[PDB]
Amino acid sequence: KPHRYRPGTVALREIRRYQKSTELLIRKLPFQRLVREIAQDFLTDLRFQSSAVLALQEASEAYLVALFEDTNLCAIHAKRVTILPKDIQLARRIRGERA
Amino acid sequence: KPHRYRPGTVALREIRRYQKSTELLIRKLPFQRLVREIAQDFLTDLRFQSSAVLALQEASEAYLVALFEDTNLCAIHAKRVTILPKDIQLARRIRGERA
Amino acid sequence: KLELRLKSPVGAEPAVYPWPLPVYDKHHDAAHEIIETIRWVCEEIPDLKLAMENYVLIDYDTKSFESMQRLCDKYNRAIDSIHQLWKGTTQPMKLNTRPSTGLLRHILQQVYNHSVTDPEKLNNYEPFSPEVYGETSFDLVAQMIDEIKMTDDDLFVDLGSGVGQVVLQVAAATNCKHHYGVEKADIPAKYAETMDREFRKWMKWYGKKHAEYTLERGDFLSEEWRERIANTSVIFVNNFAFGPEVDHQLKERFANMKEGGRIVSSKPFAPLNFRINSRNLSDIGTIMRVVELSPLKGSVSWTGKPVSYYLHTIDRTILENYFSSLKNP
Amino acid sequence: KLELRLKSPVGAEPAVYPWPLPVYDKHHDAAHEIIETIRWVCEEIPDLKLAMENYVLIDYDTKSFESMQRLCDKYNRAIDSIHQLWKGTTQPMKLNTRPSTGLLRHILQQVYNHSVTDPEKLNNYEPFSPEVYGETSFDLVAQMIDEIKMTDDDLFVDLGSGVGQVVLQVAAATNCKHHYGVEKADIPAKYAETMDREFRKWMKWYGKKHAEYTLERGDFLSEEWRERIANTSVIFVNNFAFGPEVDHQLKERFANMKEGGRIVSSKPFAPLNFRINSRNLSDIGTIMRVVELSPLKGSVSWTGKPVSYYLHTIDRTILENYFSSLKNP
Amino acid sequence: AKRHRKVLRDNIQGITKPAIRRLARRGGVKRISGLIYEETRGVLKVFLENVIRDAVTYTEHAKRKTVTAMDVVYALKRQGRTLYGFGG
Amino acid sequence: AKRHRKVLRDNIQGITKPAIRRLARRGGVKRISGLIYEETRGVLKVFLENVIRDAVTYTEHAKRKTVTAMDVVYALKRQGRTLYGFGG
Amino acid sequence: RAKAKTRSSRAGLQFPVGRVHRLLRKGNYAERVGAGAPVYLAAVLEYLTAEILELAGNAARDNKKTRIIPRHLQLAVRNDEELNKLLGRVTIAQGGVLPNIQSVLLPKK
Amino acid sequence: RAKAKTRSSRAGLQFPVGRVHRLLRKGNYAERVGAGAPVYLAAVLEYLTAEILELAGNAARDNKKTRIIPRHLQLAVRNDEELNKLLGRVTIAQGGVLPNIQSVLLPKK
Amino acid sequence: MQIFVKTLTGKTITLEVEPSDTIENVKAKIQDKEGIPPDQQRLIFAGKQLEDGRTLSDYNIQKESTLHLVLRLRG
Amino acid sequence: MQIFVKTLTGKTITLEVEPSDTIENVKAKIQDKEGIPPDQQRLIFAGKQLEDGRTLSDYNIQKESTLHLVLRLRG
Amino acid sequence: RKTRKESYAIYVYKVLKQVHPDTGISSKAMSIMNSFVNDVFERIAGEASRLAHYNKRSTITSREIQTAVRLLLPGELAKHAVSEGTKAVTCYTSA
Amino acid sequence: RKTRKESYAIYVYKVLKQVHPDTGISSKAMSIMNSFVNDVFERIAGEASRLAHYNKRSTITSREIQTAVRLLLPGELAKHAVSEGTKAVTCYTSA
DNA sequence: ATCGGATGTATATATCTGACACGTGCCTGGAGACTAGGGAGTAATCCCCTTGGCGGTTAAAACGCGGGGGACAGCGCGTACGTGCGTTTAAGCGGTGCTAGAGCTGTCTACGACCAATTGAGCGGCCTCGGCACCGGGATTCTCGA
DNA sequence: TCGAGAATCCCGGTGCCGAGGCCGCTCAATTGGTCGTAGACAGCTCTAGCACCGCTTAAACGCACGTACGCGCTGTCCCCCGCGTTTTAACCGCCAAGGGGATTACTCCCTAGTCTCCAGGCACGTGTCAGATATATACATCCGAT
Ligand SMILES: C[S@@+](CC[C@H](N)C(=O)[O-])C[C@H]1O[C@@H](n2cnc3c(N)ncnc32)[C@H](O)[C@@H]1O
Ligand SMILES: C[S@@+](CC[C@H](N)C(=O)[O-])C[C@H]1O[C@@H](n2cnc3c(N)ncnc32)[C@H](O)[C@@H]1O
Fold first, then answer.
1. Which residue's alpha carbon is at the smallest distance from atom 13 of ligand 2?
2. Reduced DSSP (H G I as helix, E B as strand, rest coil) percent helix, strand, coil of chain K, to 5
3. Closest to C184 (Cα-Cα) out of C214, C220, C213, C158
4. I need a labelling partner for B30 at 20 to 30 A (CA). Which of B84, C46, G41, L38 fits?
5. From the C1' of M142, which residue's alpha carbon is nearest?
């Protein structure tokens, strides 16, 4: 006897909540460490002015949001609602990156 | 009591026959007239050196062949074999031209 | 050396035709020319065909000597019989009847076929210049003549009149005061001076009256034309290939037109969605309303698809309303 | 001012420790150091722990005065008891036993901890220069020492020896003649001269013998080194950040190596799929075979992912076979 | 005489159905729905208009009257459709 | 003392599942299969490696040691990912 | 020597014609630069910036705000179908996305 | 005056170092051109052309032909996965496509 | 002198001036009450174009006169 | 003088020459029978490097001698 | 006591105070407008450079700028852009 | 009696007669190789030009060409390309 | 699974044509020798900003349980697409003739680079106030189980 | 078809920090002349784009038949969503150090510009052989049938 929404309405609520805002959606310290340990593959050591890590995060977020916008069209094309990995793989190929 | 192949084997024969060759697949005089009457929308009159119409035909063929190569992946994604217009429209959008 | 003459239903004027007829395209020549103008007169008056389908049937021989002189003999003395039908107290239908659409179209195509000898010469211009040649169809001019409603106190100027068929059609279909066409190039102007003659000739031969017009050779960007453009009611300009330097100057000349002056143009002299702020107060689009005409097909001479023609109207009330709603806050 | 001394199982050599112990990272210091070297000797001989798990249990106090001197008193006179166990006609196990893998790893990490004081100074170099510092792990060196099989008539040189841990490990695990390391920079060389001392010290303290080596300071691109590179059997070079200008010169120096000479390298001096035609007959890849070693993880010091190390072998038979199959047609 | 510039019209119907089907076979397509043949003519007309418009802009800058093959090669390169073999 | 360069490893697990799901919601996705969260980390690691490699090539040409924001903006512009707002 | 008068003022412009001339001249574009090239280029740049700023201001006003922030530039660009083609491959930082949901996902009635 | 010697011969090259120097110098790339820039650029261009021509010749040989035609350049490029990235957006005229059929289309057994 | 200024939209504004006022002031007065910049105003009366250098008395404009306001384009 | 040239692959080629022949000719002879360019050939015998300017008699190479052929890199 | 670093901030602000006289701009949006102007500058100027190499001229003129604008901008932006540039060059030469 | 129009045909042919000594080229394939060389020339030279504007230098040197090659070519082509260029510049200066 | 007939694909042989590869003459661009000036290389100084460590508060991540909706397999029907055949349309090929317009050459004038003096536009530094964010409280809307 | 309850909006109240405006001061844009080369224009030549004709045959077209495939429906089930509790580590505020990025002053060597000269590479001709085309035959795949 609690109250409980039906599966799929809180999702449509989060859609609007996150398409209305402009904030970044990944934590900042985890992403900074990821950048900093990708750049270890160059034997020398580097220092990453802070606006650089911010620029990297902006471009990284904006790449994934549009990849998901294409994955969704692929999934709806197959008469589905759930997105699966075989939709990412088709978006990235038709788009011109995987082949 | 003639002999007759089953639907889908002559198609797979034409696939190989046309993926083995390099000739152009559109008639030349019809295509030349199409180019020449697209260029009428500029009030002045133009003259079209002949290698120009050949270059246009090469690029036009090579655009459509790759558009069909993407349409096929879209159709196979939907668990189909027949390609339909809603597959062209998805290839052209994911690819970045229709939106 | 003999004739293929025919006789004038109104007035007494001869038409002349040499036996070797002119050469035209795939299947077109003075044969359909003459048989059809006969058909148009028989539609003009009913007693003529009531005399001109007796005795005869439908088709005739185009290449033969005696079939054309058959038609000429029959038509000429049948019209003499009509003259005797009208010898009494009877009086024919009016002389000042503005010709109907089909009759006028036949007239203009007749004039064009006769005067312009070598149309491929009209293509001798400089590429991508303001002097390129292109022609407007009969149906688009008709649509425009019915969209704008010229009273008897309007002046009509046609900038870049080409050969002159636009001014001839408007002068024969409208009741205005005077009509002008100015044309800079040489080759179209040399044909315009023939079109003028031949139009007056064929028009009074049929017995229909028109307004009065003048097909001059000049330059609408001259010092003498600035105040003639400012003293004009309706302007027709085909500025498809004039480019941005001549259109800028025509914009500078249209600012001085009177209220309610209208222009029609291939390309618009102002955007169709012209907003207005403190930054474009020098633009001419701030004192005019632009409406796109319906794109009927076959509208121009250079392509097959339809083109629209953008009627503009001069109305300075929009500028004052903007200024007056500016003082609201 | 007192001690934390302990006693040598083979030989009579003292170890010294000040009461304020050195400072290391999160949880690491001379406490685990000493308790573990005791553990390694107790694994070395069984009678020691059969005397050294009596009387005691497993854990001990790291910060306390009397627990460490407990361990020192116990160990020192228990080893004196072992000395008395060996006072008779008995003779201990051999002195020239090459130390096992775990024992050797403890030795090298012990030496590195003691000599290198301020490791962050090793990062004082010029960016993207040939002088950048980077270190190879113990496991990758072991893999290489087992992949190449050095006999007792091979010479091993290590170009850019860094601090020297590679040459120390190879000199203690292989039976060769002599071993050389050359190092140009200043800061790593100043630590190398300490590593050498401390390695000899701790090695003869434990009682294990090694080959003979030399950690020199120089420049492998000198005039004096060209014929030492040509007179060498196996070469180890970490040319990850040497760039194409120094690698071109090292290629020009490797051409004169003898048959069967082997190199190992971070980056390959020749493609893994080197074809051969009339156009690359000057390339060094035309006289050598390149094989990529297995990429075990934790292989280098600067990143966590695994890197491969590309064994090359000099074999001029491929060039003559190409020339000899050239005359077939 | 009769008017200048003999005008051409509806030439897209010259890209016939067997031609579209050969292009599909080279693209690797086994079965073609029957509504594809008009969607394809639309796609082709758009592509060709976009390329010929730039080819004519280039040919008008140079103050000439024939479209050369370099005008087409530049118009294509400007859209990312680089073409090798016609004089680039 | 202990070795230089405290090494970092498996930091891709910091792109956590709720973060991937927020990005999906902003992209307009209603329901997410449970195998998406690893395909996505793969895609992200490839993108980031390709951009940071060029940013470091630019920062090494200039003979310096910190990656500035202009290095990232140039590395992005070179792949067609123009970015406005960081000093371009 | 007469009274100075910037080249922008003769043209009727707000953008710097002399600075554009210098940036063209020092930019390795051609051996020589004409006289009307900076005037033309500065007039075009100013037209485009006014075109964007007008729509950005509209979007800021109907959010009940008096300042333009990157979200309003983003909305202005993506909602206009010809600025969206010019800027089809740029990423405006802190700009978000357009609100858009597919109609098969909305709940049925 | 000594004996002339082309700059290609000092470098060991087959491509024209003097012509590359001229094309860089007359091409509006920078105010000045170094001395090793044409040598480096000509060596790189020659390496890449040899890399393509080798694979094109292989493809021509296993078609049982002794001349290279555009089909062999196409096959060589598309079958190599790093030349296919350099030339990922070019169209080789009269080159055809690679033979490739999807495995769901082949007849079942 | 009281004057009326008639606009093309059938709007009339009433103004109070004296013949001794300058043309700069009159144009400013129209701007002041309706917001129209003086450079766009062209005033025509009894077929005369008003000239910057004349005075109101110069044109013999008397009390209860009506002026015509035509709007122009800028440049 | 008959000589044998031993290669590193256990191949031996037999050649017929006279001591009066030049070094250019001998290198050409090796090229002639096996196709190896002379500039890549380095010949070593009894620890001596053969010098371009010496003759075969200079090195006291007598009948039934064996030469060693080492292959070099080009430049 | 820093070096001087220039930008289009004040001209962007002058244009804004004409289209919307009672609106301001945030600093981060002025950065975006600044990079926008530079981006379109380099597109147009590079296209005009190329266009002048093709024809074997060595001057960038007001014809190259017009043609580069017609090549780069989309359909209806390009009309208004060339009509702005033409008016500017005219007001300039007639002075 | 035409003007002189130059190309890379003879250098492409010299390189081919080294990799495959008994192969020829058709005329249409020599056109393709000719446009390939020009295309890669302009890519590398334009990237080096840009790279020298960023750093406020006014010389295109052998460092700009090396860095532009490392930026443009894919992973394993770029290694061999820089090792070819380095060898050439070395053989040149030591002469 | 195996077998037989008919169709389509590959393989070997002759002949022939036109495009490639090679040789010749000439001319224009690349190499050689040299001088002058400015760009980049190097050393030294300064100070901003990147890195690292600490503690506390709380927001977000991780984990687990319950159930419902959506993915996916199976089955049936019916239309629309493939295959083949006879008829009809125009592409392709060749050959001819014309004349326009692209390409080149020779003059000459205007336009843009360069330079020296000078002064105002635009930048950095510095305040001040108002737009916007954060917060509490009431109203309204929307979802879900009746 | 409608109540309960959770989520979202809307209306005031307080504060702060960033936008906007003002000042002083360099340094870059403007003015006024001079010079020399790019490009504009007139005239000439000759190649190649356009238009026409006829003929042969290949490809497009229209049609009839049947079958495989697209699409709708139904049933199972399991996996993803919504929610509540616990655990982790992000964020924020603060402090301290020292490195490396940015600037300035000198000096030298590498590159542009010039003049002479000569050979490499282009256009033009010309011969021969690689590849296409046609025919005859082997055989490999398909489909109906058992
Ligand atoms: C496009 S034609 C229009 C023909 C005619 N208006 C019609 O519709 O039938 C425009 C004509 O304007 C003429 N023209 C161009 N510029 C002109 C100018 N500046 N002054 C006078 N006539 C001009 C040209 O000769 C050209 O023939
Ligand atoms: C990457 S470190 C390798 C460290 C060591 N080899 C190891 O694996 O532990 C390479 C060393 O080579 C040295 N080095 C670089 N160039 C050198 C040269 N030209 N001559 C001698 N040593 C050089 C540098 O000092 C650098 O410390």
1. D160
2. 75, 5, 25
3. C220
4. B84
5. A9
